[PDB]
Amino acid sequence: RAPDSVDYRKKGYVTPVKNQGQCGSCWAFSSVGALEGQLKKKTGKLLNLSPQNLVDCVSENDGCGGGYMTNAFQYVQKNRGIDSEDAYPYVGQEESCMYNPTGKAAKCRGYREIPEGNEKALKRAVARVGPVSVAIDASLTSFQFYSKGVYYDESCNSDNLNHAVLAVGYGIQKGNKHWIIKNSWGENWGNKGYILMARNKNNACGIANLASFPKM
Ligand SMILES: *[C@@H](CNC(=O)[C@H](CC(C)C)NC(=O)OC(C)(C)C)CC(=O)N(Cc1ccccc1)Cc1ccccc1
């Protein structure tokens, strides 16, 4: 069995919470979070990678109009690299692709998908691999006002995925099982930019419906 709780923040695999601003770039933050995890695991280095690189250059995605993490990992593969945040800083508006090989800070050898709706497999992937990119319904007012505790809302729609976040761990808070979720809505949203989302409550908010992680 994988451990009963895992928190990659404790192991230095997770960079500070970012703010996407007025740009539908959640998919780009999710993607860099998962690549930042694999980079810490494989090199021992924790550094901010470049969401802007993905926003401006993933031509299969729609920049500030939205995107998929799988598309981003395929781009980092084909492109033979992703820049550091330092070499390709975040603007929060879509600009023409300015990828600079000099600033390359990680590569990607492909990616894997979690079987759709399978929270057991998502748990094993987080334990075995590290932080995993996930998609959720974040449309509910209850989501936007989250403060503390383990978030569950029966009105959450697992067939309405509209937001990309990062599962950096999982655990059990006073008997309530959860996913530890890094958002990209700033340090002052939720609990310092994080939300605990209900785990093993019938794929709540579709947490295991579009999960993926990069190979490195
Ligand atoms: C970030 C925008 N979402 C996406 O990119 C989705 C991610 C999938 C994994 C679900 N993909 C998508 O829609 O791609 C296509 C190709 C355009 C279809 C999520 C986000 O921050 N926002 C969306 C949202 C909508 C309702 C309630 C909560 C969140 C909010 C947002 C939008 C624009 C600017 C800033 C924030």
PDB file of all heavy atoms in Angstrom, residues 20-28 60-69 71 134-140 143-144 160-165 183-185 210, ligand 1:
ATOM      1  N   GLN A  20      -2.603  33.535 -11.493  1.00  0.00           N
ATOM      2  CA  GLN A  20      -2.777  33.575 -12.957  1.00  0.00           C
ATOM      3  C   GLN A  20      -3.257  34.962 -13.434  1.00  0.00           C
ATOM      4  O   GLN A  20      -3.063  35.242 -14.618  1.00  0.00           O
ATOM      5  CB  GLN A  20      -3.671  32.427 -13.445  1.00  0.00           C
ATOM      6  CG  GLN A  20      -5.074  32.403 -12.913  1.00  0.00           C
ATOM      7  CD  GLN A  20      -5.745  31.082 -13.256  1.00  0.00           C
ATOM      8  OE1 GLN A  20      -5.607  30.039 -12.591  1.00  0.00           O
ATOM      9  NE2 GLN A  20      -6.532  31.134 -14.302  1.00  0.00           N
ATOM     10  N   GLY A  21      -3.888  35.787 -12.582  1.00  0.00           N
ATOM     11  CA  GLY A  21      -4.429  37.092 -13.004  1.00  0.00           C
ATOM     12  C   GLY A  21      -5.632  36.903 -13.905  1.00  0.00           C
ATOM     13  O   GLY A  21      -6.284  35.856 -13.778  1.00  0.00           O
ATOM     14  N   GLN A  22      -5.888  37.839 -14.813  1.00  0.00           N
ATOM     15  CA  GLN A  22      -7.068  37.806 -15.716  1.00  0.00           C
ATOM     16  C   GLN A  22      -6.710  37.034 -16.977  1.00  0.00           C
ATOM     17  O   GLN A  22      -6.733  37.591 -18.069  1.00  0.00           O
ATOM     18  CB  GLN A  22      -7.517  39.205 -16.116  1.00  0.00           C
ATOM     19  CG  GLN A  22      -7.988  40.019 -14.945  1.00  0.00           C
ATOM     20  CD  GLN A  22      -7.942  41.486 -15.320  1.00  0.00           C
ATOM     21  OE1 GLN A  22      -6.945  42.158 -15.094  1.00  0.00           O
ATOM     22  NE2 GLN A  22      -9.026  41.974 -15.895  1.00  0.00           N
ATOM     23  N   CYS A  23      -6.334  35.785 -16.809  1.00  0.00           N
ATOM     24  CA  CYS A  23      -5.936  34.911 -17.931  1.00  0.00           C
ATOM     25  C   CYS A  23      -6.379  33.494 -17.581  1.00  0.00           C
ATOM     26  O   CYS A  23      -6.059  33.090 -16.461  1.00  0.00           O
ATOM     27  CB  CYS A  23      -4.433  35.043 -18.058  1.00  0.00           C
ATOM     28  SG  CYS A  23      -3.667  34.001 -19.303  1.00  0.00           S
ATOM     29  N   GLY A  24      -7.071  32.809 -18.478  1.00  0.00           N
ATOM     30  CA  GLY A  24      -7.461  31.393 -18.288  1.00  0.00           C
ATOM     31  C   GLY A  24      -6.261  30.465 -18.473  1.00  0.00           C
ATOM     32  O   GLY A  24      -6.347  29.593 -19.282  1.00  0.00           O
ATOM     33  N   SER A  25      -5.207  30.642 -17.680  1.00  0.00           N
ATOM     34  CA  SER A  25      -3.910  29.943 -17.799  1.00  0.00           C
ATOM     35  C   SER A  25      -3.743  28.887 -16.692  1.00  0.00           C
ATOM     36  O   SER A  25      -2.607  28.399 -16.506  1.00  0.00           O
ATOM     37  CB  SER A  25      -2.810  30.961 -17.791  1.00  0.00           C
ATOM     38  OG  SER A  25      -2.828  31.705 -16.571  1.00  0.00           O
ATOM     39  N   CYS A  26      -4.813  28.540 -15.986  1.00  0.00           N
ATOM     40  CA  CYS A  26      -4.812  27.480 -14.932  1.00  0.00           C
ATOM     41  C   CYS A  26      -4.059  26.242 -15.469  1.00  0.00           C
ATOM     42  O   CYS A  26      -3.199  25.712 -14.752  1.00  0.00           O
ATOM     43  CB  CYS A  26      -6.231  27.134 -14.472  1.00  0.00           C
ATOM     44  SG  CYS A  26      -7.348  26.561 -15.788  1.00  0.00           S
ATOM     45  N   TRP A  27      -4.350  25.818 -16.706  1.00  0.00           N
ATOM     46  CA  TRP A  27      -3.748  24.615 -17.334  1.00  0.00           C
ATOM     47  C   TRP A  27      -2.219  24.743 -17.370  1.00  0.00           C
ATOM     48  O   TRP A  27      -1.515  23.709 -17.191  1.00  0.00           O
ATOM     49  CB  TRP A  27      -4.343  24.419 -18.734  1.00  0.00           C
ATOM     50  CG  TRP A  27      -4.083  25.525 -19.691  1.00  0.00           C
ATOM     51  CD1 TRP A  27      -4.913  26.567 -19.974  1.00  0.00           C
ATOM     52  CD2 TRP A  27      -2.889  25.721 -20.471  1.00  0.00           C
ATOM     53  NE1 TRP A  27      -4.313  27.402 -20.876  1.00  0.00           N
ATOM     54  CE2 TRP A  27      -3.107  26.864 -21.251  1.00  0.00           C
ATOM     55  CE3 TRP A  27      -1.696  25.000 -20.642  1.00  0.00           C
ATOM     56  CZ2 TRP A  27      -2.160  27.345 -22.138  1.00  0.00           C
ATOM     57  CZ3 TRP A  27      -0.770  25.465 -21.545  1.00  0.00           C
ATOM     58  CH2 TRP A  27      -1.000  26.624 -22.282  1.00  0.00           C
ATOM     59  N   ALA A  28      -1.707  25.964 -17.579  1.00  0.00           N
ATOM     60  CA  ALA A  28      -0.248  26.239 -17.691  1.00  0.00           C
ATOM     61  C   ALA A  28       0.407  26.156 -16.300  1.00  0.00           C
ATOM     62  O   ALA A  28       1.457  25.491 -16.153  1.00  0.00           O
ATOM     63  CB  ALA A  28      -0.025  27.557 -18.377  1.00  0.00           C
ATOM     64  N   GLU A  60      -1.416  24.042 -29.667  1.00  0.00           N
ATOM     65  CA  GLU A  60      -2.602  23.157 -29.528  1.00  0.00           C
ATOM     66  C   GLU A  60      -3.519  23.639 -28.407  1.00  0.00           C
ATOM     67  O   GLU A  60      -4.646  23.168 -28.348  1.00  0.00           O
ATOM     68  CB  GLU A  60      -2.154  21.715 -29.280  1.00  0.00           C
ATOM     69  CG  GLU A  60      -1.390  21.159 -30.455  1.00  0.00           C
ATOM     70  CD  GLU A  60      -2.249  21.127 -31.698  1.00  0.00           C
ATOM     71  OE1 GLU A  60      -3.401  20.760 -31.558  1.00  0.00           O
ATOM     72  OE2 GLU A  60      -1.774  21.509 -32.789  1.00  0.00           O
ATOM     73  N   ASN A  61      -3.048  24.519 -27.518  1.00  0.00           N
ATOM     74  CA  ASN A  61      -3.900  25.181 -26.498  1.00  0.00           C
ATOM     75  C   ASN A  61      -4.296  26.586 -26.985  1.00  0.00           C
ATOM     76  O   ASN A  61      -3.787  27.000 -28.061  1.00  0.00           O
ATOM     77  CB  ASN A  61      -3.210  25.195 -25.139  1.00  0.00           C
ATOM     78  CG  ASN A  61      -3.258  23.830 -24.481  1.00  0.00           C
ATOM     79  OD1 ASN A  61      -4.079  22.988 -24.857  1.00  0.00           O
ATOM     80  ND2 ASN A  61      -2.413  23.636 -23.472  1.00  0.00           N
ATOM     81  N   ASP A  62      -5.149  27.274 -26.214  1.00  0.00           N
ATOM     82  CA  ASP A  62      -5.819  28.551 -26.586  1.00  0.00           C
ATOM     83  C   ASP A  62      -5.309  29.683 -25.687  1.00  0.00           C
ATOM     84  O   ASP A  62      -6.109  30.622 -25.430  1.00  0.00           O
ATOM     85  CB  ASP A  62      -7.342  28.407 -26.443  1.00  0.00           C
ATOM     86  CG  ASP A  62      -7.956  27.493 -27.487  1.00  0.00           C
ATOM     87  OD1 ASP A  62      -7.223  27.079 -28.396  1.00  0.00           O
ATOM     88  OD2 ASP A  62      -9.173  27.228 -27.405  1.00  0.00           O
ATOM     89  N   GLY A  63      -4.051  29.633 -25.242  1.00  0.00           N
ATOM     90  CA  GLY A  63      -3.458  30.695 -24.409  1.00  0.00           C
ATOM     91  C   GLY A  63      -4.301  31.050 -23.199  1.00  0.00           C
ATOM     92  O   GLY A  63      -4.607  30.126 -22.364  1.00  0.00           O
ATOM     93  N   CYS A  64      -4.745  32.308 -23.095  1.00  0.00           N
ATOM     94  CA  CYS A  64      -5.603  32.765 -21.964  1.00  0.00           C
ATOM     95  C   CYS A  64      -7.042  32.266 -22.103  1.00  0.00           C
ATOM     96  O   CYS A  64      -7.836  32.451 -21.161  1.00  0.00           O
ATOM     97  CB  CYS A  64      -5.584  34.278 -21.786  1.00  0.00           C
ATOM     98  SG  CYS A  64      -4.000  34.870 -21.148  1.00  0.00           S
ATOM     99  N   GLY A  65      -7.355  31.628 -23.222  1.00  0.00           N
ATOM    100  CA  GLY A  65      -8.680  31.077 -23.518  1.00  0.00           C
ATOM    101  C   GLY A  65      -8.800  29.636 -23.043  1.00  0.00           C
ATOM    102  O   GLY A  65      -9.883  29.090 -23.171  1.00  0.00           O
ATOM    103  N   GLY A  66      -7.747  29.050 -22.474  1.00  0.00           N
ATOM    104  CA  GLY A  66      -7.826  27.706 -21.876  1.00  0.00           C
ATOM    105  C   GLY A  66      -6.992  26.685 -22.603  1.00  0.00           C
ATOM    106  O   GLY A  66      -6.348  27.003 -23.635  1.00  0.00           O
ATOM    107  N   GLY A  67      -6.950  25.477 -22.065  1.00  0.00           N
ATOM    108  CA  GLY A  67      -5.978  24.486 -22.536  1.00  0.00           C
ATOM    109  C   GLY A  67      -6.007  23.194 -21.752  1.00  0.00           C
ATOM    110  O   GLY A  67      -6.675  23.120 -20.735  1.00  0.00           O
ATOM    111  N   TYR A  68      -5.255  22.218 -22.219  1.00  0.00           N
ATOM    112  CA  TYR A  68      -5.056  20.908 -21.545  1.00  0.00           C
ATOM    113  C   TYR A  68      -3.582  20.742 -21.194  1.00  0.00           C
ATOM    114  O   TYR A  68      -2.676  21.099 -21.950  1.00  0.00           O
ATOM    115  CB  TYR A  68      -5.607  19.769 -22.411  1.00  0.00           C
ATOM    116  CG  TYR A  68      -7.091  19.876 -22.634  1.00  0.00           C
ATOM    117  CD1 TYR A  68      -7.596  20.294 -23.855  1.00  0.00           C
ATOM    118  CD2 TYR A  68      -7.979  19.612 -21.597  1.00  0.00           C
ATOM    119  CE1 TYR A  68      -8.962  20.413 -24.050  1.00  0.00           C
ATOM    120  CE2 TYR A  68      -9.340  19.715 -21.775  1.00  0.00           C
ATOM    121  CZ  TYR A  68      -9.833  20.114 -23.006  1.00  0.00           C
ATOM    122  OH  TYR A  68     -11.177  20.247 -23.147  1.00  0.00           O
ATOM    123  N   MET A  69      -3.380  20.151 -20.031  1.00  0.00           N
ATOM    124  CA  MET A  69      -2.070  19.815 -19.473  1.00  0.00           C
ATOM    125  C   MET A  69      -1.398  18.817 -20.420  1.00  0.00           C
ATOM    126  O   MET A  69      -0.201  19.056 -20.713  1.00  0.00           O
ATOM    127  CB  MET A  69      -2.208  19.259 -18.051  1.00  0.00           C
ATOM    128  CG  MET A  69      -2.759  20.292 -17.077  1.00  0.00           C
ATOM    129  SD  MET A  69      -4.541  20.418 -17.125  1.00  0.00           S
ATOM    130  CE  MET A  69      -4.968  19.138 -15.947  1.00  0.00           C
ATOM    131  N   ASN A  71      -1.544  18.482 -23.639  1.00  0.00           N
ATOM    132  CA  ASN A  71      -1.064  19.294 -24.781  1.00  0.00           C
ATOM    133  C   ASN A  71       0.237  19.970 -24.386  1.00  0.00           C
ATOM    134  O   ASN A  71       1.192  19.959 -25.173  1.00  0.00           O
ATOM    135  CB  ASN A  71      -2.145  20.277 -25.230  1.00  0.00           C
ATOM    136  CG  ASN A  71      -3.241  19.563 -25.975  1.00  0.00           C
ATOM    137  OD1 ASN A  71      -3.018  18.434 -26.373  1.00  0.00           O
ATOM    138  ND2 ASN A  71      -4.377  20.203 -26.219  1.00  0.00           N
ATOM    139  N   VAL A 134      -4.422  17.824 -12.228  1.00  0.00           N
ATOM    140  CA  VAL A 134      -5.846  17.354 -12.211  1.00  0.00           C
ATOM    141  C   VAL A 134      -6.769  18.488 -12.694  1.00  0.00           C
ATOM    142  O   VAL A 134      -6.378  19.667 -12.637  1.00  0.00           O
ATOM    143  CB  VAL A 134      -6.238  16.821 -10.819  1.00  0.00           C
ATOM    144  CG1 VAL A 134      -5.314  15.713 -10.313  1.00  0.00           C
ATOM    145  CG2 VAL A 134      -6.277  17.936  -9.772  1.00  0.00           C
ATOM    146  N   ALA A 135      -7.953  18.112 -13.178  1.00  0.00           N
ATOM    147  CA  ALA A 135      -9.046  18.999 -13.624  1.00  0.00           C
ATOM    148  C   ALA A 135     -10.255  18.791 -12.726  1.00  0.00           C
ATOM    149  O   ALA A 135     -10.550  17.648 -12.317  1.00  0.00           O
ATOM    150  CB  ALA A 135      -9.390  18.732 -15.070  1.00  0.00           C
ATOM    151  N   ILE A 136     -10.949  19.880 -12.417  1.00  0.00           N
ATOM    152  CA  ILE A 136     -12.099  19.871 -11.484  1.00  0.00           C
ATOM    153  C   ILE A 136     -13.161  20.840 -12.015  1.00  0.00           C
ATOM    154  O   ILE A 136     -12.836  21.788 -12.811  1.00  0.00           O
ATOM    155  CB  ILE A 136     -11.657  20.265 -10.053  1.00  0.00           C
ATOM    156  CG1 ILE A 136     -10.975  21.626  -9.999  1.00  0.00           C
ATOM    157  CG2 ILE A 136     -10.759  19.204  -9.423  1.00  0.00           C
ATOM    158  CD1 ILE A 136     -11.015  22.266  -8.589  1.00  0.00           C
ATOM    159  N   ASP A 137     -14.376  20.651 -11.534  1.00  0.00           N
ATOM    160  CA  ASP A 137     -15.421  21.713 -11.539  1.00  0.00           C
ATOM    161  C   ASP A 137     -15.139  22.637 -10.340  1.00  0.00           C
ATOM    162  O   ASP A 137     -15.344  22.200  -9.209  1.00  0.00           O
ATOM    163  CB  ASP A 137     -16.785  21.051 -11.492  1.00  0.00           C
ATOM    164  CG  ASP A 137     -17.932  22.021 -11.399  1.00  0.00           C
ATOM    165  OD1 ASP A 137     -17.716  23.218 -11.688  1.00  0.00           O
ATOM    166  OD2 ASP A 137     -19.018  21.560 -11.004  1.00  0.00           O
ATOM    167  N   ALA A 138     -14.669  23.841 -10.615  1.00  0.00           N
ATOM    168  CA  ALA A 138     -14.385  24.917  -9.652  1.00  0.00           C
ATOM    169  C   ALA A 138     -15.440  26.039  -9.837  1.00  0.00           C
ATOM    170  O   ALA A 138     -15.175  27.192  -9.379  1.00  0.00           O
ATOM    171  CB  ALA A 138     -12.996  25.379  -9.897  1.00  0.00           C
ATOM    172  N   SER A 139     -16.616  25.697 -10.416  1.00  0.00           N
ATOM    173  CA  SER A 139     -17.657  26.679 -10.841  1.00  0.00           C
ATOM    174  C   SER A 139     -18.512  27.122  -9.645  1.00  0.00           C
ATOM    175  O   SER A 139     -19.157  28.188  -9.742  1.00  0.00           O
ATOM    176  CB  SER A 139     -18.543  26.151 -11.967  1.00  0.00           C
ATOM    177  OG  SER A 139     -19.401  25.137 -11.494  1.00  0.00           O
ATOM    178  N   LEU A 140     -18.563  26.326  -8.587  1.00  0.00           N
ATOM    179  CA  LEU A 140     -19.485  26.560  -7.445  1.00  0.00           C
ATOM    180  C   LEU A 140     -19.003  27.714  -6.564  1.00  0.00           C
ATOM    181  O   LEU A 140     -17.803  27.812  -6.208  1.00  0.00           O
ATOM    182  CB  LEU A 140     -19.656  25.268  -6.648  1.00  0.00           C
ATOM    183  CG  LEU A 140     -20.422  24.180  -7.410  1.00  0.00           C
ATOM    184  CD1 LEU A 140     -20.630  22.954  -6.547  1.00  0.00           C
ATOM    185  CD2 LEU A 140     -21.775  24.718  -7.910  1.00  0.00           C
ATOM    186  N   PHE A 143     -16.840  26.676  -3.767  1.00  0.00           N
ATOM    187  CA  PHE A 143     -15.404  26.499  -4.111  1.00  0.00           C
ATOM    188  C   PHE A 143     -14.679  27.831  -3.953  1.00  0.00           C
ATOM    189  O   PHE A 143     -13.632  27.919  -3.324  1.00  0.00           O
ATOM    190  CB  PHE A 143     -15.187  25.946  -5.525  1.00  0.00           C
ATOM    191  CG  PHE A 143     -13.738  25.643  -5.831  1.00  0.00           C
ATOM    192  CD1 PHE A 143     -13.164  24.430  -5.472  1.00  0.00           C
ATOM    193  CD2 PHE A 143     -12.932  26.603  -6.405  1.00  0.00           C
ATOM    194  CE1 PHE A 143     -11.822  24.154  -5.750  1.00  0.00           C
ATOM    195  CE2 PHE A 143     -11.594  26.349  -6.656  1.00  0.00           C
ATOM    196  CZ  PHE A 143     -11.037  25.126  -6.312  1.00  0.00           C
ATOM    197  N   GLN A 144     -15.262  28.869  -4.512  1.00  0.00           N
ATOM    198  CA  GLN A 144     -14.609  30.201  -4.589  1.00  0.00           C
ATOM    199  C   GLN A 144     -14.438  30.775  -3.174  1.00  0.00           C
ATOM    200  O   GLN A 144     -13.414  31.397  -2.936  1.00  0.00           O
ATOM    201  CB  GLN A 144     -15.371  31.075  -5.584  1.00  0.00           C
ATOM    202  CG  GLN A 144     -15.439  30.421  -6.962  1.00  0.00           C
ATOM    203  CD  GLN A 144     -15.740  31.367  -8.102  1.00  0.00           C
ATOM    204  OE1 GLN A 144     -15.904  32.570  -7.916  1.00  0.00           O
ATOM    205  NE2 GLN A 144     -15.806  30.815  -9.308  1.00  0.00           N
ATOM    206  N   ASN A 160     -18.455  18.513 -15.670  1.00  0.00           N
ATOM    207  CA  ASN A 160     -18.218  19.939 -16.028  1.00  0.00           C
ATOM    208  C   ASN A 160     -16.812  20.346 -15.554  1.00  0.00           C
ATOM    209  O   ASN A 160     -16.683  21.094 -14.568  1.00  0.00           O
ATOM    210  CB  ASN A 160     -19.352  20.821 -15.472  1.00  0.00           C
ATOM    211  CG  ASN A 160     -19.174  22.301 -15.759  1.00  0.00           C
ATOM    212  OD1 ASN A 160     -18.470  22.674 -16.691  1.00  0.00           O
ATOM    213  ND2 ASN A 160     -19.758  23.154 -14.935  1.00  0.00           N
ATOM    214  N   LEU A 161     -15.759  19.810 -16.171  1.00  0.00           N
ATOM    215  CA  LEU A 161     -14.372  20.173 -15.760  1.00  0.00           C
ATOM    216  C   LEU A 161     -14.083  21.546 -16.377  1.00  0.00           C
ATOM    217  O   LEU A 161     -14.225  21.692 -17.622  1.00  0.00           O
ATOM    218  CB  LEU A 161     -13.380  19.111 -16.235  1.00  0.00           C
ATOM    219  CG  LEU A 161     -13.715  17.678 -15.826  1.00  0.00           C
ATOM    220  CD1 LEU A 161     -12.743  16.676 -16.467  1.00  0.00           C
ATOM    221  CD2 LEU A 161     -13.739  17.528 -14.306  1.00  0.00           C
ATOM    222  N   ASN A 162     -13.693  22.540 -15.564  1.00  0.00           N
ATOM    223  CA  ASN A 162     -13.444  23.914 -16.071  1.00  0.00           C
ATOM    224  C   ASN A 162     -12.175  24.512 -15.457  1.00  0.00           C
ATOM    225  O   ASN A 162     -11.863  25.647 -15.776  1.00  0.00           O
ATOM    226  CB  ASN A 162     -14.678  24.783 -15.771  1.00  0.00           C
ATOM    227  CG  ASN A 162     -15.186  24.598 -14.353  1.00  0.00           C
ATOM    228  OD1 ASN A 162     -14.418  24.693 -13.410  1.00  0.00           O
ATOM    229  ND2 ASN A 162     -16.469  24.248 -14.188  1.00  0.00           N
ATOM    230  N   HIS A 163     -11.459  23.797 -14.600  1.00  0.00           N
ATOM    231  CA  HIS A 163     -10.287  24.393 -13.885  1.00  0.00           C
ATOM    232  C   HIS A 163      -9.222  23.321 -13.713  1.00  0.00           C
ATOM    233  O   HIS A 163      -9.593  22.114 -13.556  1.00  0.00           O
ATOM    234  CB  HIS A 163     -10.759  24.989 -12.571  1.00  0.00           C
ATOM    235  CG  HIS A 163      -9.706  25.716 -11.821  1.00  0.00           C
ATOM    236  ND1 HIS A 163      -8.677  26.373 -12.428  1.00  0.00           N
ATOM    237  CD2 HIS A 163      -9.555  25.924 -10.497  1.00  0.00           C
ATOM    238  CE1 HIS A 163      -7.894  26.906 -11.502  1.00  0.00           C
ATOM    239  NE2 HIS A 163      -8.428  26.661 -10.306  1.00  0.00           N
ATOM    240  N   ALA A 164      -7.966  23.705 -13.866  1.00  0.00           N
ATOM    241  CA  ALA A 164      -6.802  22.812 -13.767  1.00  0.00           C
ATOM    242  C   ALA A 164      -6.013  23.200 -12.527  1.00  0.00           C
ATOM    243  O   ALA A 164      -5.694  24.353 -12.408  1.00  0.00           O
ATOM    244  CB  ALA A 164      -5.931  22.933 -14.991  1.00  0.00           C
ATOM    245  N   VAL A 165      -5.668  22.233 -11.680  1.00  0.00           N
ATOM    246  CA  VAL A 165      -4.937  22.484 -10.416  1.00  0.00           C
ATOM    247  C   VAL A 165      -3.909  21.367 -10.261  1.00  0.00           C
ATOM    248  O   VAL A 165      -3.731  20.575 -11.203  1.00  0.00           O
ATOM    249  CB  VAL A 165      -5.924  22.564  -9.237  1.00  0.00           C
ATOM    250  CG1 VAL A 165      -6.762  23.823  -9.346  1.00  0.00           C
ATOM    251  CG2 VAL A 165      -6.838  21.337  -9.141  1.00  0.00           C
ATOM    252  N   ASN A 183      -3.864  25.653  -5.829  1.00  0.00           N
ATOM    253  CA  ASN A 183      -4.532  26.525  -6.821  1.00  0.00           C
ATOM    254  C   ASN A 183      -3.515  27.546  -7.345  1.00  0.00           C
ATOM    255  O   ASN A 183      -2.375  27.569  -6.842  1.00  0.00           O
ATOM    256  CB  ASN A 183      -5.791  27.146  -6.209  1.00  0.00           C
ATOM    257  CG  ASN A 183      -6.859  27.519  -7.207  1.00  0.00           C
ATOM    258  OD1 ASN A 183      -6.662  27.486  -8.428  1.00  0.00           O
ATOM    259  ND2 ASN A 183      -8.006  27.908  -6.683  1.00  0.00           N
ATOM    260  N   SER A 184      -3.896  28.329  -8.364  1.00  0.00           N
ATOM    261  CA  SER A 184      -3.092  29.374  -9.037  1.00  0.00           C
ATOM    262  C   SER A 184      -3.897  30.693  -9.011  1.00  0.00           C
ATOM    263  O   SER A 184      -3.829  31.454  -9.993  1.00  0.00           O
ATOM    264  CB  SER A 184      -2.765  28.955 -10.456  1.00  0.00           C
ATOM    265  OG  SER A 184      -3.940  28.618 -11.188  1.00  0.00           O
ATOM    266  N   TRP A 185      -4.620  30.939  -7.921  1.00  0.00           N
ATOM    267  CA  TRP A 185      -5.471  32.142  -7.710  1.00  0.00           C
ATOM    268  C   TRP A 185      -4.866  33.030  -6.616  1.00  0.00           C
ATOM    269  O   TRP A 185      -5.617  33.826  -6.049  1.00  0.00           O
ATOM    270  CB  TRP A 185      -6.925  31.771  -7.364  1.00  0.00           C
ATOM    271  CG  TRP A 185      -7.683  31.131  -8.485  1.00  0.00           C
ATOM    272  CD1 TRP A 185      -7.277  30.993  -9.772  1.00  0.00           C
ATOM    273  CD2 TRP A 185      -9.009  30.600  -8.425  1.00  0.00           C
ATOM    274  NE1 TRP A 185      -8.235  30.352 -10.512  1.00  0.00           N
ATOM    275  CE2 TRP A 185      -9.305  30.099  -9.709  1.00  0.00           C
ATOM    276  CE3 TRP A 185      -9.946  30.427  -7.397  1.00  0.00           C
ATOM    277  CZ2 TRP A 185     -10.510  29.476  -9.996  1.00  0.00           C
ATOM    278  CZ3 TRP A 185     -11.117  29.775  -7.676  1.00  0.00           C
ATOM    279  CH2 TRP A 185     -11.394  29.311  -8.962  1.00  0.00           C
ATOM    280  N   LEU A 210      -9.581  13.715 -15.279  1.00  0.00           N
ATOM    281  CA  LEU A 210      -8.574  14.190 -16.269  1.00  0.00           C
ATOM    282  C   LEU A 210      -7.255  14.477 -15.561  1.00  0.00           C
ATOM    283  O   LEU A 210      -6.743  15.642 -15.637  1.00  0.00           O
ATOM    284  CB  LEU A 210      -9.138  15.433 -16.968  1.00  0.00           C
ATOM    285  CG  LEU A 210      -8.497  15.771 -18.310  1.00  0.00           C
ATOM    286  CD1 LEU A 210      -8.723  14.636 -19.310  1.00  0.00           C
ATOM    287  CD2 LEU A 210      -9.036  17.062 -18.845  1.00  0.00           C
TER     288      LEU A 210
HETATM  289  C1  LIG B   1      -8.452  28.009 -16.129  1.00  0.00           C
HETATM  290  C2  LIG B   1      -9.084  27.926 -17.523  1.00  0.00           C
HETATM  291  N1  LIG B   1      -9.489  26.547 -17.784  1.00  0.00           N
HETATM  292  C3  LIG B   1      -8.995  25.773 -18.765  1.00  0.00           C
HETATM  293  O1  LIG B   1      -8.009  26.077 -19.435  1.00  0.00           O
HETATM  294  C4  LIG B   1      -9.644  24.393 -18.954  1.00  0.00           C
HETATM  295  C5  LIG B   1      -8.865  23.349 -18.150  1.00  0.00           C
HETATM  296  C6  LIG B   1      -9.295  21.893 -18.297  1.00  0.00           C
HETATM  297  C7  LIG B   1      -8.331  20.978 -17.576  1.00  0.00           C
HETATM  298  C8  LIG B   1     -10.672  21.702 -17.733  1.00  0.00           C
HETATM  299  N2  LIG B   1      -9.680  23.983 -20.344  1.00  0.00           N
HETATM  300  C9  LIG B   1     -10.503  24.574 -21.231  1.00  0.00           C
HETATM  301  O2  LIG B   1     -11.541  25.116 -20.931  1.00  0.00           O
HETATM  302  O3  LIG B   1      -9.938  24.513 -22.457  1.00  0.00           O
HETATM  303  C10 LIG B   1     -10.643  24.755 -23.746  1.00  0.00           C
HETATM  304  C11 LIG B   1      -9.681  24.237 -24.795  1.00  0.00           C
HETATM  305  C12 LIG B   1     -10.801  26.255 -23.881  1.00  0.00           C
HETATM  306  C13 LIG B   1     -11.989  24.069 -23.882  1.00  0.00           C
HETATM  307  C14 LIG B   1      -9.523  27.898 -15.052  1.00  0.00           C
HETATM  308  C15 LIG B   1      -9.883  29.226 -14.427  1.00  0.00           C
HETATM  309  O4  LIG B   1      -9.071  29.802 -13.697  1.00  0.00           O
HETATM  310  N3  LIG B   1     -11.120  29.754 -14.632  1.00  0.00           N
HETATM  311  C16 LIG B   1     -12.272  29.032 -15.208  1.00  0.00           C
HETATM  312  C17 LIG B   1     -13.442  28.975 -14.258  1.00  0.00           C
HETATM  313  C18 LIG B   1     -14.741  29.026 -14.743  1.00  0.00           C
HETATM  314  C19 LIG B   1     -15.811  28.995 -13.864  1.00  0.00           C
HETATM  315  C20 LIG B   1     -15.589  28.940 -12.504  1.00  0.00           C
HETATM  316  C21 LIG B   1     -14.306  28.895 -12.010  1.00  0.00           C
HETATM  317  C22 LIG B   1     -13.233  28.907 -12.886  1.00  0.00           C
HETATM  318  C23 LIG B   1     -11.421  31.112 -14.131  1.00  0.00           C
HETATM  319  C24 LIG B   1     -10.703  32.228 -14.859  1.00  0.00           C
HETATM  320  C25 LIG B   1     -10.952  32.469 -16.206  1.00  0.00           C
HETATM  321  C26 LIG B   1     -10.309  33.513 -16.859  1.00  0.00           C
HETATM  322  C27 LIG B   1      -9.406  34.299 -16.174  1.00  0.00           C
HETATM  323  C28 LIG B   1      -9.131  34.048 -14.847  1.00  0.00           C
HETATM  324  C29 LIG B   1      -9.772  33.014 -14.189  1.00  0.00           C
END
